[PDB]
Amino acid sequence: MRRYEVNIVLNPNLDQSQLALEKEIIQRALENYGARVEKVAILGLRRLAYPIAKDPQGYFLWYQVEMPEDRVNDLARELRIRDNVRRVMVVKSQEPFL
């Protein structure tokens, strides 16, 4: 098992309601791939390094999880496919939240 930080960028045009749902769905997907979600945070709107879908902004969601390394890729694939998901980045935790 490995601990990861899942960084998700969502459509900046979604409202409080839509963001909450995507956040819940994404969390359900993580667990579906054997993950145990330790922490979640809504980081908010940020100016992307490069526009995605013609929009220079994105809404950031963050998750800290522990899951089988062998399921991360498939998980990353599924999430990138979501309509409201603009960017997915799963990295190995360095200084995990307690």
Side-chain angles (χ1 to χ4, degrees), residues 81-97:
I81 284 301
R82 297 189 64 63
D83 299 304
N84 300 314
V85 170
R86 293 291 187 290
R87 198 181 68 201
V88 172
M89 203 168 87
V90 184
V91 299
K92 177 72 149 59
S93 171
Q94 286 170 290
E95 306 193 302
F97 281 84

Side-chain angles (χ1 to χ4, degrees), residues 22-68:
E22 275 298 331
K23 169 181 174 297
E24 179 177 352
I25 296 180
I26 292 174
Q27 184 167 312
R28 283 181 143 70
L30 289 166
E31 304 177 315
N32 184 55
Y33 284 85
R36 176 166 274 113
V37 181
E38 313 181 324
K39 194 191 187 70
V40 185
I42 308 168
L43 282 50
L45 217 60
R46 308 182 71 173
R47 206 293 181 188
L48 307 180
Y50 58 85
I52 297 177
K54 272 55 181 181
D55 203 308
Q57 301 180 186
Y59 202 80
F60 289 59
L61 291 187
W62 175 91
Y63 305 75
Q64 176 173 289
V65 305
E66 175 173 50
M67 68 187 288

Side-chain angles (χ1 to χ4, degrees), residues 4 35 41 49 69 73 75 78 81:
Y4 302 97
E69 72 178 335
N73 194 215
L75 164 59
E78 183 176 304
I81 284 301

